[PDB]
Amino acid sequence: LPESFDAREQWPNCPTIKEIRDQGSCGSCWAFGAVEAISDRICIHSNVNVEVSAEDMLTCCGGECGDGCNGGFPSGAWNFWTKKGLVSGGLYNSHVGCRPYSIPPCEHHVNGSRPPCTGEGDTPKCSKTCEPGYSPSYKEDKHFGCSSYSVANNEKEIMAEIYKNGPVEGAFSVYSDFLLYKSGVYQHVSGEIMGGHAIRILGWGVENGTPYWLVGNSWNTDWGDNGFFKILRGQDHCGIESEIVAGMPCT
């Protein structure tokens, strides 16, 4: 395996890999890490480009994935993709796809022009219909996964999975010092625990002798490094290597 790897550069024909979304004032990271990676993989293994609906995942999976805006289970999300499939749907107010995200973007621990985020956000309804004007129907717009699996807590295996099949979803413990991340390789040194956070791992590298994972967060582009961040790799730091999940699209 190479010393560094950036899925954005390796798969130029898949622009979703470079995208950063905004989960808004809702604990839907579990859903975002999943639909983002799934969007990437649909493109990688179908060379079609689809903005997979975070809304569909968040609202219609149900108990199998956890508790909507109150948190969820990454592996459960990929299961939903293989069982019920996912329709398309872009950013809030984009009118792109069957079910665009319904929760407004906000400022995640940074100052900006958008309203500040509020942890208080209710899970939107599961509506099996597409926005007006969109075709085909909800049922016909479903994209299915044909496998859902969990990658072992093994650096090399995780790198191999990304190298061959594309970005994966992962999760780690977020402490307050992570909230102010701006650059460099993140390593937890202080701060109260905020909770578990699901994200998208799209590569790896070494910065100043420090091995890291290239990760895309779902807190918009003005947080961190243009929406992305790097975290220590190889020591299951904050559990970053302990909950890796992925899957392959049908056909």
Ligand SMILES: *[C@]1(C(=O)N[C@H](C(=O)N2CCC[C@H]2C(=O)OC)[C@@H](C)CC)O[C@@H]1C(=O)NCCC
């Ligand atoms: C993962 C999750 O969404 N985490 C939270 C979060 O990202 N936000 C909620 C409101 C807007 C976000 C923010 O800006 O937080 C600062 C927080 C708690 C993480 C830092 O609860 C979700 C998950 O599904 N839980 C289980 C772990 C996989």
